[PDB]
Each structure stands twice: as structure tokens, then as C-alpha cells.
Ligand binder design. Structure first.
Ligand code: 25E
Ligand code: 25E
Ligand code: 25E
Ligand code: 25E
Lengths: 810, 810
């Protein structure tokens, strides 16, 4: 039907049809009379997966013969989403499958909707890992993603009476056709026990054993026949476990609980023993696998030439002392050489500056769980602090600031300090974030070792985030500049020479309109809600956090509502304001914010005077598959974190690529997006990092803003008095109290500039032609934010490997 | 290679080879350089399973069009064993697969050894269910086996220092290629709650819900293209389960524990809540499925014409009040009509007379767990007892004897009494057993309703138990009488006219010798033990129980040893004495018996004076796959239970069919085996049922035997003094104490006759020609003990359906 979706050749279509029927019959054990849509989805999944096999086998064969340096990306999160459409896109099968299913009397789109997301992540950090895997394959790198196969991913969110309820994400219930179990590469992981000292070395003994069983999922590159591996570990009890009898068998669950569930905290640290176990489990199994592969290529001097380990935040930081443990205790290398190998092997990526998000494990936990690792950590700290003492003689305060061991009521290990010490590179995820690392939280470390510190601005894959979710945009672009931009996103710059082209302007705007109509229809069907598709689609989608300032958006919404009620017969640009995202189950303020959003909707959406001029919708169960639908339909992208708090953001880049304009603070990657597009093509408002610092010195007084802005005072009085909760008038007192007396993120200080900047958005929207020309200038300059660029920089600047765009033989 | 294993046609062999390679590539994701024996097994399993699909689909289609009466066989146990070879046998694929694998450079036998048993049963009752499914398919009956998919089957037994250790039977670890998950037919099962009475009916409310997810396994008939279904339920938590957050997800395990593990008790009742839950779980899910299928054919009068439910012991006895619950509470039928339907639908098979094996559930358990069922049971009891009162006026003691409710310290429900009341037929499993039911434990019920009581003597399938495990015997038989006996085992009678045929005598004996050499080689390879293949193979394999009198065998063994040590230079017929079987983990005496057996071996097998004249071996981990190996190699079958205690036995029939002679008491099916073969062709010894009763009246005094038999006294003095346990001289005091003072099974009373009868065995073995002629007379008369005969009798006499030998279209 459309060009970018590949060829629908006669032989390919015939071949897909017959393999589809074969799978329906032999694999699913059904015929056409009894089959449900789900059976049809599964027959298609199996038909598609068959095309990965040859390439997957030959790619891994290739790495064995060529023996390139291997990249190991260790993450506790891989937020993959759905796999069917992505696989078709990367193999150029989409149009052929569309045609094959059409002739079988099936709608492929309807079948696509049946697949559950692999929701093995919380948000941005987990999605980054997934985008990275795609780019690593597309760039021909010998890369492996290693993580945990959680039985339950991020919870499904239901909204009940305006409140978030959680339900278990039982994503494996019907079976996962995209994975291959590899029980033959099952490995032991050790826990607890004690340290014994012998004549020649320490020994870790009397351990409890848990088995790590790998499941491999293929990662196809974009049309290059490269198929890499994501290996996810599942926890299994050994067979003599606990071995009255009935209870011993039932207690196997305790061991297997390690891989049961993803911790649902976005940007918050919870010092729970189960989480620690998960962190060690992935690290111990992965390293054994790494070393096995390295030996099957004694000379551990070549280890760093053949191995790179990337730590996705501090979550797999135990990789550092585990590598040391294996090299010293088992391989019998001397400490200093083992350490040299470790540093040159490992690199650490930091994803946050929020103090509450930094992992600081209590010493008593590590003592019981991983006694040898603690000993190794103490030894690392002693030797590191000796270097600091020598570089900064007599600077006693520097010593306690830089120590891996934090003193206090409970002694803790600072995992970030561990990571910096045991890595040859440390990067932040956007230029301002990386600068904040050098200037503030890791200042001491940067002064000791400036060479270690780097920036790698985040990106998103243009395969999932343009071609897959916005085929109509991808196609109107390809008609003018060809298809090569899909794996070389800098080519979008060529679109600048079409900014005054009347045909292109019309087409860009038509595609957006079609996406909005499709999403507006989606909302009615599955959620019975009415929206005006002519309105400006104002969307804020991301995890619910105080720092992300969904509350600032709320205040804007109420301001608009109050202004309409003030002058009802005045013209306003109509808006559909959509806010979505999950709150962490324990995060009370975030749950209150959700309730506020729905409570605002209840008032606004039923006021007869408002009409179809303002709608407020809470987008339930925001997740990768939902992002793929709402992002292409958006006009306005809300990126409004307090400057200095969003390390990068990636949602921001998704919106930019799909034809939304951005209202945002100079925070995270927003700064670089504004720089690429030009500041006149971005709706920038609010305090910069320096303004925040100035206010912090002086002291943030929210009352000042309340006193001087009458529109803001009215909103606070509405919230307090029970205007938005008539039956429970004090419902939102926690929110008012926080805003007035305890606001770490200074919502009030940015309110005036935000509202003003929002008026400028509405003005531009009144002029369809100029709105669209600014949109074109955003899409045209979004090339930098491809994860192919990001990964090319990791490869050259950290891992010491060259990317390749060459095809492997088909 | 051999005739009975089917044709190896050029097209079939070519087709198997290519489908094998296709599966190795697309299914397993391997090539020939990396594949292990297990991968090769799995490629073959998938290649074979593909041939079941068309037939499986068309068989179930057929039942839908013809709407025959359906048979539902409800069991908590299905001891299936391995499936690969059985599938090949029933589809006539064995020689073709053998040839296909040979040409790929593979030994199919070696691949067969890789498959784990489906060990979903304890022993005879579980194996009976499996044999029945095979016969039901072979006889063209519309039959379904319903049970539980246990994650852990019967434990693997390891012997450590002579003691049984248990390890979890993690049989699903590598995935089960023979099942198809059917998550779409998932059904709710209710637990706990309370009973509310409304204007129109009782209602069961506030229940905890557990989901029942079915897995279907095909059951192929022998060469008739009929493929029936075994449906096994797995327990799943609902998704809002318990729904702080992390714990709620982890607590899902509590619900899913229902299908976790098989209770390892053979012939013993343990009143554990988890077991009760398992019993209701299978019953509730199965009945919903039954009723669904019945409606998709309001007129519940036709229910019994379209449905038969067979209860395999009392384990699924809750079927009776559950059917009543559904018919009264949900369908709103009046009690009396619902009851009529129930009785005509249900039939009960009893498998034991041991009082400790009868299920008697505490009232307080049913009250909490199944409050409505208890109410229904009370109502059944009241109405049943009113019938008894009317038939036997003033017989107050009869009333309390027949009550479903037993009074005492704890009130209990007698599940056997429930079953008799709610069933139109009650059968025992061998003629003497069924007679014992009418004369003793169910005497009162037989007097009230003599028409209900029947016999159905057990059988074994000749597919697994001759063709599969003894191809060499099957072939020498087929050479003379054709292949038709495989599904008409009465034809073995034709072999009587070959009892003096010199060629046949030679061939029968050659096959046994070959089987003995193969098993003797098997023992050295996998267990490093030396045996003399010229010796008489004396085997007792079955679960370890006091009633089965492994101890009587032990005493014989020691007698032989003592006699040799007495007259070392006298000739004795050499014996290899093999004893194997699992003990229930809680059963202390059974565990002591195992230790005695190994301790005897330790002494006998290392005495230089004994030589290769006597060997005592404990066969570790006895299970279906091991039975298939040892039974064909056996010369002497030990069936030596105290008369009145073994309801039937089926092991006995397996040995008879495979060319072993039987030494046994007149107990269970032994009586009918002796009757078929002629008593001169059986080694019968010991007390009959009547002799046991006589001794019981008088009082069993073990001391009498100890005093009067000097050979027996010596053995007791050896056991007591520590001859068989020099380091722990008092090790066997519990055993001696039991034999001397507390022996329910009268081991001593049968000792003299046993030893004497064993001398007569040795004498016959000295005459190879006459041994073999007696063997021929056993095999020739083993036809009665085919489960095809058994199932034909259930069909005609209980279920009201005609068996059919006709082929369905291929
Ligand atoms: O069908 C559901 C089951 O599929 C199996 N996969 C098997 S047996 N082969 N898979 C091959 C394969 C997987 C991914 C591909 O891209 C290509 C082939 C997996 O190992 C199971 O974990 C899963 O439950
Ligand atoms: O391969 C391992 C997996 O196989 C799946 N089976 C599938 S997807 N199809 N099975 C078809 C089938 C089964 C038995 C047959 O005899 C014929 C076909 C089962 O549903 C899973 O429970 C199992 O783990
Ligand atoms: O670089 C990718 C993205 O990473 C996110 N960080 C996230 S989602 N978690 N960051 C830290 C963290 C997460 C879970 C924890 O349990 C502890 C720390 C940042 O907040 C984003 O600004 C950034 O775009
Ligand atoms: O009919 C088949 C076979 O059934 C067996 N009975 C068995 S193995 N269990 N019988 C009762 C029982 C089992 C487990 C329980 O938890 C309770 C009762 C009998 O002991 C055999 O003599 C007979 O051949």
C-alpha cells in the first residue's frame, strides 16, 4: 500500500500464506472454524519469527569466526513493547504480511493489537535500553543485552473513581513466541555463606545456590540481516532444594521469587533485600557467561580488548566487585592486574541527580548476602582513598565525601562512588546533565580523574518511533528524500528546503489530522470518551513525578477553565489536554496528582458553558504500545520539569520526530533540541538552572507568588475549599500544603511564564500554515536524537569499536 | 528391521528426515554443529507430534457431529511414562523413524532415553488410568481423561548410604512437547466463602477464586486414527489477586500451589487441606467443562444418556455434591430430579480395603473450605438414611454404620459411603476384591442395593506392555499367529498349540536371554554393578509397603545366604534377586525396609564364599520407564502380598505377558491369573483369605513360628545382633519388634510355605526346556488381562456404550 513498508512480491505472499496455515494447523492445533483472533495473531507471530532464524544463527556464527570485541549492555530494565510490527519493519516484511493476511480474510492491524507489551521496565531508562539494542544491531555491533526475565512486568493501571489501582502484568500467560529457552546454558548463582581464608586465597563457602536459566530473544537490525541477542535470566531452584516433603517442594518458590516481579520505582531507591538479590543474580550469571565466551575464543590481559561491559545506572554495579572476585579468588590473578582489567572493561552511565534515586545499600545487608563482595568493596575503597589522599594531601573532608562507605546511623555503600572508581568512563545522558555531574554531585571525582567524564546525549530509534508508529509521516518524507534517512536520520535536514513548499506543508498537516482522527476514534471505541479532533492536542505523557510537574500543567488547565467561566462568550483556541502516566505504588503524592487530574476532568468535561472548547483526559495505562498511538497524534509536547531535574528525557525526542511542537524548560535534552531547531521554533519558558540556584540561596517562598498573582490565588482557594471535590472538601489539602510550604520543585515560580508561553502557543495554532512550517523545522532538525548517533558515540568514544552499515549475507 | 514395528517406506522416510531438519532449525534454533542429544530428541518429538494433529482435530470434529455419549474418567493420577515410543507404536511410525534417524546418523534408542517420564501418579492406580486411556482410544470410545497437571510428579529416588532420599521431579524443566496449553478455556474455581439463603435458593458468596487452566495431551488409539484427549488443569491466580504491591504479586504463589505437587502416598490417607483443595479443583473445573460441552450439543433428563463420569477411587468424590450444587443452586432443578441425574451419571471404582487408605475428611475442613458442599452432603445423608430406616426398620446400628457422617472426637465424612450413595455402579478391581467388598467393608450397602455392585478385573495395555517394551517377544509371536493379537489379546491362546514346537521353545528362551543380557548391560553402564546373566532373575518391583511383604522376600534371601554358608560346596541355582520401589516419604517402616534390602546386599554381594551364586540388588528409582526395561528381563515375578490385601495388582499381569513365571499368594488378580493359566503353571503358596481370617479369630502369635522354625530364629538373631549392621548393631530393632509383636500382615505365617515353594522354582529352572514350556502356557493364557477387555466391560456394563474396532478415515 505505502512505499516504506517494503515489497509485496508474489512468491513472498504465497509463501507467507502457506506458512501461516501450517502454523495454525500444526503449531496451534486449530482449523479456521474454531480459531479466535488470538490464534490468528499467534500463527502470524510464528510465521514471522521463522524469518529470524537463519539470520540469527548466521550472525552468531559470524561473531564466532571474526571474534570481534563484544559489547555487554547490563540493565535491570528492557522496556521492549510489542515485537510483531518491529520485526516486520526490520525485515521489510510489513506489506507482504499485510497482503498475505488480507487474502486470508484478516486485518493485520487487529491482530497486532492482541500482542501484550513486554513491559520489562518503568519508563525512560528501560526504554533507552530497548532503543539501544535496536541501534546496536542496526550498526552491526557484536552486542548482547543482559537482564532479568520478570514474570510480572510493570503493573497494568486501572482508574477506579479517579484513583490508580494496580493489577499484575501477567504478560506470559499465553506464552511468549519471541523467546527461546536455553535450559542447557543454566548457571549457578551463590548467596549468603561465609568467607574462609586459606594459605592461598579467600574462599566463599556454605552458600545457598539459585539457578539462572537464560531465555534468548533476537534483536534484528534494520534491513542489514544482523540479528543480535537479548539474554534474560529466570530464577530456578536446584532439584535437591530444601531436600516435610510437600513443604520442601513448595518452598522452591522462595528461590524463584528472584525473577518474579519488576520493582515499579521510577527515580526512587528502595533498599529491599529482594531487589539486591535481583541485582546480584543478573550480574553473577552474566559475568560467568561473559567469561565462558571469552575463554572459548588464561591471557586476561586481552579481556578488555575483547569485552566491554556497560552498566545501565548503578543497578548492575555489583559487576565491578564480582569481576574482581572471579579474577582474584578463582583465576588467581594479583589484585592490581585484576583491577586494571576491571577498570578497562567497565563503564558507567548515570541517569539521575535526584539524591533519593541514588542506590546506597546498608552494610548489614551486603554482609549477610554477599560477604566476600563487601570485603572486596572495603579493599577497593581503601586503595581508592589512598590515591585521593596522595593527590589532595591533608584534605580530610574530601576523603569522607569520596568514600564508597558512608558513615551515619546505618553504614551504607554508595554504589555510584563504586561505579566511578571501577570504570574507565562515566557519562551523563544530555550535555547539561553531564555538566551538572562535573560541577556538583561528582565534582570531587571529576577533579581526581577528569578523563573519565563524558557526555552521551540520549536518542530514540527512528524505526519504532517514526516508521512503525507513523507510517504516513515516514512515507511523505520518503517521497521527497528517499528512504535512506531511516538509518541515517541526519538526512531529515534536507527537509529544510521544503519549508515553503505548498504541497509538503499540506501533506505534513494532513498526516497529523489523520493521526488525530485515528486516535480520537481509538478513544471512543475502547474507552467511550468524546473528543473534538479539531482541538489542539495538548499532551503530557510520562511517569507521574513531582519533578516532572504534571501539577504545573494542572494549574494551567484550571487557569484556562477559570478564564472561560469569566468571559464565556470570548473565543479561545479549543484544546484537548491529555495527561497520562503511572505512579509508583508507594508514592502517595503521585497518586494524589492522578486523582487531581481526573477530578479536574470531572468538573471541566461536564460544564455546559465550556462546551467542546476544553477537554481534560487522563490517559489510562500509559505504556510503549500507547505511546506509539498518542505521540503521532500530538500537537503540543509538554516537557516542563524544573530545570536541573530531568537528566535527559526521551519522550521529548519522540514528539519532536512526529510533528508536535514543544513547550518546555531548559532542562535535560530540551536544551539541545532547542539548539538544533532554533529557539524561535521552540516554546521555551521558565527558570534556567542558574535561576533555580539563585532562588535556592535566597530561599524559595511560595507565599510570595500566592500573594502577587490573583489568578494563582483563586486556583489555590478552589483546591482548598473543595470546588474540585464537593463531597470530600479537604481531599486535596496535602497538595495545597506541599505547594505552599514544601515544594522542592518550585511549581509557583514558573507559573506566570508558563501561562504566558501557553498563550503564545494558542496564537500560533490560530495560523495553521505557520504552525506547520514550524513543525517542519522541528522534524527537519530532529536527526541528532537518533539512537544510531548515540550508539555510534558510545562505540567510538567508550567501547573502542567501529560501527558498520554493511549487510551480512542474506 | 522387525515386522511388528511397521513399514519404512521411501516417501515416509524422506518426509521424516526433512521435517526433522526443519524442526531442528526453525523450532530448536540449532544447526548440526551445536546440537546436543537433547536437541535431537526434541526435533524427533516435534516431528512425531505433527502426525497426531490431523487425526486429533478430525476425531474431536467427529464427536461433535455424531454426538455420542461421552466418558469422563476423573483421576488425581495419570502415570503416563514416556510418550515418544508409544506414539510411534500407535501410529505405525517406529521403523520409519528408526530408519530416518539412522540415515541422519542418530541412534533413536539413545534419543528415547532422554525423555523424562510423565510421573503423574504413585503406582498401580495411576498406571491403571494411563492403560485405560490407551484402551479407550483403541476401542473408539469418546473418552476424556481429566486430572491435574502437577508441576512436580512423584519424586526421584536416590539411595544414599542405603537410605532413600527424595528429590523434586522437575519434569517440565525443558518443556513438555506433548501438551497443548488451552488458556482460552480457563475456568474459575471457588473456595471458602459462606452460604446465604434467599427466597429462591441457597447462594455461595464471598469466595476466593482460583483459575483452572487446561492443558490437552492427545491419546492415540492403536492404528485406528482415533486420538482422544487427556485434559490436565493447572492452577493460576486471577490478575487482581490480593490487589504491599510486591508482596501481593509474590502471594500469587499461594493460589498456584494447588497444582504444584503430587501427594506421594500410595495406599495411605493424609487429611491435609492442600490435598482437599486439589480434589475440589479438578472436580469443579472438570464438571463446568462437562456441562459446557453438554449444552453445546436445558433438558437435563438427557444428561445421563450423554454423560458418564467414572470416579477413580474416592479422590474425585466431590463430583457428586458438586453436580448436585450446580443442578440445584444454578440450574434450579428440584432436589429429587437432580439426584436422579447424578446417580445415573456417576460410577465409583474402589481400589483398596485397607482402613488407613480410606478418605475420611474432618467436618471442620469442609465447613471452612466448601460450606455449601457440606450442607449438600448432610442433606444426602439424611435422605439416604431415611431409605435405610425404611428398609431395615429399627436397625439402629445399621444407621450409624452406613452414615456418611462418622461420629467421634472429630466428626468426619466417609467419602466411600458418599460414593456408593451417589453412584449407580460400584466396582472392585479383581473378582476376590469385589467379593470382599460385598462380604465385609460394604456389606450393609450391598444388602440395601445389590444391583449397584460389580466386578471389573484390572488389565494392562498390550501396546506399552508387550509391543513397546518387548519387541522381540512381540515379533516371534507375530511370526506364528499374525499381528491381530495386539488389539485382541485373547488370540494369544493360539500359542498353546506351539507348546511342544521346538523352534518356538528355542525362540521364546532366546528372547528372554537377549532381554536379560540387555538389562545386565544396562546395570553396569548407568550403575556400575556386576551381575551374572545366567542366573535366575528374581524380581519384586512395586511401591514399598508392609502389606506387599518385601520383608518376606528379604527372609527368603537371608535363608538362601545362610544355607550357602552352611554347605558352601553344594550346588544351588544361581539367582539375581532384584527388589525395587519407592517408599512414601513419611512412611518410616518402608524406609527401614529399603535400608534392610541394601544392608543385606552389602553382606551378600561381598562374601567371597557366595561368589556369583547369589546377588541382591536394590533397583533405584523404580518408575514406568524402568518397568519397561526390567519386566522383559525377569524370570520370576514376586507377587507375595498377604491374601486379602492387594486389591488386584497389575504388575503381576505385566510379568505374565513378558515371559516370567509367578510365585504368589491367592490374592487380588493372582487368583484369576492362576485360574487362566492352570494352577500347575503357577507357584502358589501360603494362606488363602479364609486361613487369614481363621488366624485372626485365634490371634496371630508370631512367637509360635519363631519357636518352631530354627532357620527363621537364626535370621531374627542375625537381624537383632547386628550381623547386617555391624557399626550400628541395633539399627533394625524396629523391624524385629514389628515382626515379633505387631505384624498386621503375618510375614512369619507364610515363611515355611514360601521357602518350600521357592525350592520348587529352583528345581524347574534347572530344566530349561520345561521352564520355557510353562512360560509359554502363561503367555498363551494372559489374554484376559488386556485393558481392552477391562474397558469393553466398563463400556457395556457400566457406561452403556458399545466399543468399536473400526478405523476413522486417515
Ligand atoms: O511458543 C511458546 C514457547 O516458545 C518456545 N520457543 C521455541 S520451542 N522455539 N522458539 C524458536 C524461536 C524463537 C524466537 C525466534 O525469533 C525464532 C525462533 C520458548 O522456548 C518458550 O519459552 C515459549 O513459551
Ligand atoms: O514446545 C513446548 C511448549 O509447547 C506448546 N505447544 C504448542 S505451542 N503446540 N503444540 C502443539 C501440539 C502438541 C501436542 C501434539 O501431539 C501435537 C501438537 C505447549 O502449549 C507448551 O505448554 C509447551 O511448553
Ligand atoms: O537516560 C534515560 C532516562 O533515564 C531516566 N531515569 C530513570 S527512568 N531512572 N533513573 C534512575 C533510577 C531508576 C530506578 C531506580 O530504582 C533507581 C534509580 C531519567 O529520569 C530521564 O531523564 C532519562 O531520559
Ligand atoms: O486398581 C489399581 C491398583 O490400585 C492400587 N491402589 C492404589 S495404588 N491406591 N489405592 C488407594 C489410595 C491411593 C492413594 C490415596 O491417597 C488414597 C487411597 C491397589 O493397591 C492395587 O492392588 C490395584 O492393582
Amino acid at each position: 500500500q505505502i512505499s516504506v513498508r517494503g515489497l509485496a512480491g508474489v512468491e513472498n505472499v504465497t509463501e507467507l500464506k502457506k506458512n501461516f496455515n501450517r502454523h495454525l494447523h500444526f503449531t496451534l492445533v486449530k482449523d479456521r472454524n474454531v480459531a479466535t483472533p488470538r490464534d490468528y495473531y499467534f500463527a502470524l507471530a510464528h510465521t514471522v519469527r521463522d524469518h529470524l532464524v537463519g539470520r540469527w544463527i548466521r550472525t552468531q556464527q559470524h561473531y564466532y569466526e571474526k571474534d570481534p570485541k563484544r559489547i555487554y549492555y547490563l540493565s535491570l530494565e528492557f522496556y521492549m513493547g510489542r515485537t510483531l510490527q518491529n520485526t516486520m519493519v526490520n525485515l521489510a516484511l510489513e506489506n507482504a504480511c499485510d497482503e498475505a493476511t488480507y487474502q486470508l480474510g484478516l486485518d493485520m492491524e487487529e491482530l497486532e493489537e492482541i500482542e501484550e507489551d513486554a513491559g520489562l521496565g518503568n519508563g525512560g531508562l528501560g526504554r533507552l535500553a530497548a532503543c539501544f539494542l535496536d541501534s546496536m544491531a542496526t550498526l552491526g555491533l557484536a552486542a548482547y543485552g543482559y537482564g532479568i526475565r520478570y514474570e510480572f512486568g510493570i503493573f497494568n493501571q486501572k482508574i477506579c473513581g479517579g484513583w490508580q489501582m494496580e493489577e499484575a502484568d501477567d504478560w506470559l500467560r499465553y506464552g511468549n513466541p519471541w523467546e527461546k529457552a536455553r535450559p542447557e546454558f543454566t548457571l549457578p548463582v551463590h548467596f549468603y555463606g561465609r568467607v574462609e581464608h586459606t594459605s592461598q586465597g579467600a574462599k566463599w563457602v556454605d552458600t545457598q545456590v539459585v539457578l539462572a536459566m537464560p531465555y534468548d530473544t533476537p534483536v534484528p537490525g534494520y534491513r542489514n540481516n544482523v540479528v543480535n541477542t537479548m539474554r534474560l535470566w529466570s530464577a530456578k531452584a536446584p532439584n535437591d532444594f530444601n531436600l516435610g516433603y510437600i513443604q520442601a517442594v513448595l518452598d522452591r518458590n522462595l528461590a524463584e521469587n528472584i525473577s518474579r516481579v519488576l520493582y515499579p520505582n521510577d527515580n526512587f531507591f528502595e533498599g529491599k533485600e529482594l531487589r539486591l538479590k535481583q541485582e546480584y543474580f543478573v550480574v553473577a550469571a552474566t559475568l560467568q557467561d561473559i567469561i565462558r565466551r571469552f575463554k572459548s575464543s588464561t591471557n586476561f590481559d586481552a579481556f578488555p580488548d575483547k569485552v566491554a561491559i556497560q552498566l545501565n545506572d548503578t543497578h548492575p554495579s555489583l559487576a565491578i566487585p564480582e569481576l574482581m572476585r572471579v579474577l582474584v579468588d578463582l583465576e588467581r590473578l594479583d589484585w592490581d592486574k585484576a583491577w586494571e582489567v576491571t577498570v578497562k572493561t567497565c563503564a558507567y552511565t548515570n541517569h539521575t541527580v535526584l539524591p533519593e534515586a541514588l542506590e546506597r545499600w546498608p552494610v548489614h545487608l551486603l554482609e549477610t548476602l554477599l560477604p566476600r563482595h563487601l570485603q572486596i568493596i572495603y579493599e577497593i575503597n581503601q586503595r581508592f582513598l589512598n590515591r585521593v589522599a596522595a593527590a589532595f594531601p591533608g584534605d580530610v573532608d574530601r576523603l569522607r565525601r569520596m568514600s564508597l562507605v558512608e558513615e551515619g546511623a546505618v553504614k551504607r555503600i554508595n554504589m555510584a562512588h563504586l561505579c566511578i572508581a571501577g570504570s574507565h568512563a562515566v557519562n551523563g545522558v544530555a550535555r547539561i546533565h553531564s555538566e551538572i555531574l562535573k560541577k556538583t554531585i561528582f565534582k570531587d571525582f571529576y577533579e581526581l580523574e577528569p578523563h573519565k567524564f563524558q557526555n552521551k546525549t540520549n536518542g530514540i530509534t527512528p524505526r519504532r518511533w517514526l516508521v512503525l508508529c507513523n507510517p504516513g509521516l515516514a512515507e511523505i518524507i520518503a517521497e521527497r528524500i528517499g528512504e535512506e534517512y531511516i538509518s541515517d536520520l541526519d538526512q531529515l535536514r534536507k527537509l529544510l528546503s521544503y519549508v515553503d513548499d505548498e504541497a509538503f506543508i499540506r501533506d505534513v498537516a494532513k498526516v497529523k489530522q489523520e493521526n488525530k482522527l485515528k486516535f480520537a476514534a481509538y478513544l471512543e471505541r475502547e474507552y467511550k470518551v468524546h473528543i473534538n479532533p479539531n482541538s489542539l492536542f495538548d499532551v503530557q505523557v510520562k511517569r507521574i513525578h513531582e519533578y516532572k510537574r504534571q501539577l504545573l500543567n494542572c494549574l494551567h488547565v484550571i487557569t484556562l477553565y477559570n478564564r472561560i467561566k469569566k468571559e464565556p462568550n470570548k473565543f479561545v483556541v479549543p484544546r484537548t489536554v491529555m495527561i497520562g502516566g503511572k505512579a509508583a505504588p508507594g508514592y502517595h503524592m503521585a497518586k494524589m496528582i492522578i486523582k487531581l487530574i481526573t477530578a479536574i476532568g470531572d468538573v471541566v468535561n461536564h460544564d455546559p458553558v465550556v462546551g467542546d472548547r476544553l477537554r481534560v483526559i487522563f490517559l489510562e495505562n500509559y505504556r510503549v504500545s500507547l505511546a506509539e498511538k498518542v505521540i503521532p497524534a500530538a500537537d503540543l509536547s509538554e516537557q516542563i520539569s524544573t530545570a536541573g531535574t530531568e537528566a535527559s528525557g526521551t519522550g521529548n525526542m519522540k514528539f519532536m520526530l512526529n510533528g508536535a511542537l514543544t513547550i518546555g524548560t531548559m532542562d535535560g535534552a530540551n536544551v539541545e533540541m532547542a539548539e538544533e531547531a532554533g529557539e524561535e521554533n521552540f516554546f521555551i519558558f521558565g527558570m534556567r538552572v542558574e535561576d533555580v540556584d539563585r532562588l535556592d540561596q535566597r530561599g524559595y517562598n511560595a507565599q510570595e507568588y500566592y500573594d502577587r498573582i490573583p489568578e494563582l490565588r483563586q486556583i489555590i482557594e478552589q483546591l482548598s475549599s473543595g470546588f474540585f471535590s464537593p463531597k470530600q472538601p479537604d481531599l486535596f489539602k496535602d497538595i495545597v500544603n506541599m505547594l505552599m510550604h514544601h515544594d522542592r520543585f518550585k511549581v509557583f515560580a514558573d507559573y506566570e511564564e508558563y501561562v504566558k508561553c501557553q498563550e503564545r502557543v494558542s496564537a500560533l495554532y490560530k495560523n495553521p500554515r505557520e504552525w506547520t512550517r514550524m513543525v517542519i523545522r522541528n522534524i527537519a532538525t530532529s536527526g541528532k536524537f537518533s539512537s544510531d548517533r548515540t550508539i555510534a558515540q558510545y562505540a567510538r568514544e567508550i567501547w573502542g569499536v567501529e560501527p558498520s552499515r554493511q549487510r551480512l549475507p542474506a
